[PDB]
Paper text:
The process of eukaryotic DNA replication begins during G1 phase with the loading of the minichromosome maintenance (MCM) heterohexamer comprising Mcm2–7 subunits into head-to-head double hexamers with double-stranded DNA passing through the length of a long central channel. This topological loading requires the Origin Recognition Complex (ORC), Cdc6 and Cdt1 proteins. In budding yeast, Cdt1 forms a stable complex with MCM before loading. We propose that Cdt1 stabilizes a conformation of the MCM ring in which the Mcm2–5 gate is held open to allow duplex DNA passage required for helicase loading. To understand Cdt1–MCM at an atomic level, we determined crystal structures of two non-overlapping fragments of S. cerevisiae Cdt1 spanning amino acid residues 1–438 and 495–604.
The structure of Cdt1(1–438) was refined using two independent crystal forms to resolutions of 2.7 and 2.1 Å. The fragment comprises a pair of well-defined domains corresponding to the N domain (residues 14–298) and the M domain (residues 299–430). The relative orientation between the domains is preserved in all four crystallographically independent copies of the protein chain observed in the crystal structures, indicating a rigid linkage between the domains. Perusal of the Dali structure comparison server revealed a striking similarity between the Cdt1 N domain and Fe(II)/α-ketoglutarate-dependent dioxygenase superfamily of enzymes, such as AlkB and other DNA/RNA dealkylators, and the Jumonji C histone demethylase21. However, the key His and Asp residues involved in chelation of the Fe(II) ion co-factor in the active sites of these enzymes are not conserved in the Cdt1 N domain. Moreover, an α-helical hairpin (α6/α7), which extends the dioxygenase fold, occludes the degenerate active site of the N domain. These observations indicate that the dioxygenase structural fold was repurposed for a non-catalytic function. By docking the crystal structure of NM Cdt1 into the Cdt1 density, an MCM interaction can be modelled, whereby the middle domain of Mcm2 is sandwiched between the A-domain and AAA+ domain of Mcm2 and extends to contact the A-domain of Mcm6, following the outer perimeter of the MCM N-terminal domain. Conversely, the N domain of Cdt1 projects away from the MCM ring and does not appear to be involved in any contact with the helicase motor. The N domain of the yeast protein plays an important role in MCM loading, but makes little or no contact with MCM in our structure.
Numbering used by the authors: 14 to 159, 186 to 211, 217 to 430
Write the structure that this text describes.
C-alpha cells in the first residue's frame, strides 16, 4: 500500500532522512501521520466549505492565477508565487483561511522538500536550490457549491492536507483510491525524478474536483534551468502542465503552445497507425495467392481494434500526407479504395531499406515544417486527397 511516516515515532531530520530516502528509492507517494496540527488544519478545511468563498471578481490570468469557474458548479482558486522580485508572481494566497493552510503546508512542505532532494539528488549545487529565500509555490483550491482529474505534478513535492478523494498508481495499470482522513498526503513531482538522474521515479495522480481538494506544490525558483544540457526551465514544464489541466484557459492565453501539444498527439497517432497498418497488410497478404489488393473497408475493423479506437478511411489517408510513397491507394473496379505495398522501386526504396525508419523520419520532418512555418499551424494531419 502506501508508505506511512508516523511523526510520533520519527520527528527530527536525523531520523527522517533514512526513512524518506528508503521510501523515495521505491515510492513516490507517502502518508504523514500524527502531524501536530492536523486538527487545526482539518478545522480550517472545514471552514472553507461554508465561508471564505472564492473571489469571483478576481479573474484568472496568464499566470494561471486567480479564480476559475469550472463545470458542475465547481470553482478553482489558484495562486502561483515566486520569491524572485524580478518575477510578477507576488501572491501566495488570498483569504485568511487559505493563508493559514498555506503557512502550515509550506513550513511542513519546505522541510520535506529539502529532505527529498537530500535523499535522491547527488548534485551538491542542487542541495540548496530550495530555501526560505528561494522557492516557488502553487496553492490550488477546489470549491464545490454543495469523474477524476488526471495530472502529473512537476514540483519537488505536492502536499494534500487530507488523504481523501485521491487516487494513485502503486509501484507494485490500475488506480487505487486513498482514504486516510487522519493523514496528509505527499506526492513527488517530475522535477525530483529528473534531478535524481535515475534514482527516483514518480507517477500521475487523480483527484475529485468536487471534493474540495486543496494542494500545495513546491519548486525551486521558476527560472531554474531543468538541466545543463538544455535551455528549458521549470517555468516551461509548469506551463505545459497547466495547459493540459486547463486547455480552455490555454486557448486564450497560450494558443500556440496548446495547438503544438495537440499536434504532438496527432504525431503519436499516425506513427502507431503506420505500424498497425504494416502488420494488418502483412497478415492479409498471407491469406492471398493472387495480386488482388484488399478493399480498405475490409481492413478497418482489424486496424481499429489494434488502435483501440475507431479508425476511418480518412485516418489512413493521413499516412500518405506524411509519406505519399508509403502505400498504393486507388479506386477499384467498383469505386472502392484499395491499399497495398508498392511493387516497383523508387529513389527512396533504392536508397533506404527500412519502411519503418522511413516513415518516422518523414513524420518528424513534416512536424517541423508545420511548427517552423508562421502560417496558422494545424492540430492534426490533413487527409491526402486521392
Amino acid at each position: 500500500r502506501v508508505p506511512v511516516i508516523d511523526l510520533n515515532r520519527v520527528s527530527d531530520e536525523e531520523q527522517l532522512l533514512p526513512v524518506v530516502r528508503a521510501i523515495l528509492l521505491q515510492h513516490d507517494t507517502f502518508l504523514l501521520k500524527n502531524y501536530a496540527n492536523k486538527a487545526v488544519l482539518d478545522a480550517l478545511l472545514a471552514g472553507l466549505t461554508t465561508k471564505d468563498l472564492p473571489d469571483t471578481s478576481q479573474g484568472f490570468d496568464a499566470n494561471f492565477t486567480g479564480t476559475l469557474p469550472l463545470e458542475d458548479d465547481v470553482w478553482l482558486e489558484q495562486y502561483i508565487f515566486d520569491t524572485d522580485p524580478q518575477l510578477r508572481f507576488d501572491r501566495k494566497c488570498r483569504n485568511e483561511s487559505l493563508c493559514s493552510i498555506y503557512s502550515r503546508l509550506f513550513k511542513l512542505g519546505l522541510f520535506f522538500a529539502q529532505l527529498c532532494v537530500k535523499s535522491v539528488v547527488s548534485s551538491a549545487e542542487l542541495q540548496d536550490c530550495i530555501s526560505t529565500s528561494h522557492y516557488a509555490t502553487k496553492l490550488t483550491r477546489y470549491f464545490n457549491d454543495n469523474d477524476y482529474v488526471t495530472f502529473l505534478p512537476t514540483g519537488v513535492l505536492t502536499i494534500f492536507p487530507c488523504a481523501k478523494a485521491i487516487r494513485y498508481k502503486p509501484s507494485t495499470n490500475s488506480w487505487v483510491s486513498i482514504d486516510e482522513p487522519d493523514c496528509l498526503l505527499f506526492h513527488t513531482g517530475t522535477l525530483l525524478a529528473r534531478w535524481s538522474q535515475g534514482m527516483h521515479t514518480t507517477s500521475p495522480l487523480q483527484i475529485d474536483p468536487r471534493a474540495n481538494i486543496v494542494s500545495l506544490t513546491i519548486w525551486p525558483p521558476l527560472t531554474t534551468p531543468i538541466s545543463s544540457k538544455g535551455e528549458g526551465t521549470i517555468a516551461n514544464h509548469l506551463l505545459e502542465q497547466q495547459i493540459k489541466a486547463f486547455p480552455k484557459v490555454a486557448q486564450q492565453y497560450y494558443p500556440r503552445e496548446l495547438s503544438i501539444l495537440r499536434l504532438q498527439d496527432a504525431m503519436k497517432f499516425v506513427k502507431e497507425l503506420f505500424t498497425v497498418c504494416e502488420t494488418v497488410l502483412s497478415l492479409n497478404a498471407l491469406s492471398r495467392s493472387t495480386g488482388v489488393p484488399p478493399e480498405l473497408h475490409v481492413l478497418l475493423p482489424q486496424i481499429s481494434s489494434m488502435m483501440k479506437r475507431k479508425i476511418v478511411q480518412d485516418d489512413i489517408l493521413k499516412l500518405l500526407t506524411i509519406w505519399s510513397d508509403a502505400y498504393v491507394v486507388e479506386l477499384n473496379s467498383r469505386g472502392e479504395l484499395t491499399m497495398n505495398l508498392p511493387k516497383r522501386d523508387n529513389l527512396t526504396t533504392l536508397t533506404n531499406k527500412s519502411r519503418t525508419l522511413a516513415f518516422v523520419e518523414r513524420a518528424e520532418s513534416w512536424y517541423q515544417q508545420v511548427i517552423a512555418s508562421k502560417d496558422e499551424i494545424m492540430t492534426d494531419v490533413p487527409a491526402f486527397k486521392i
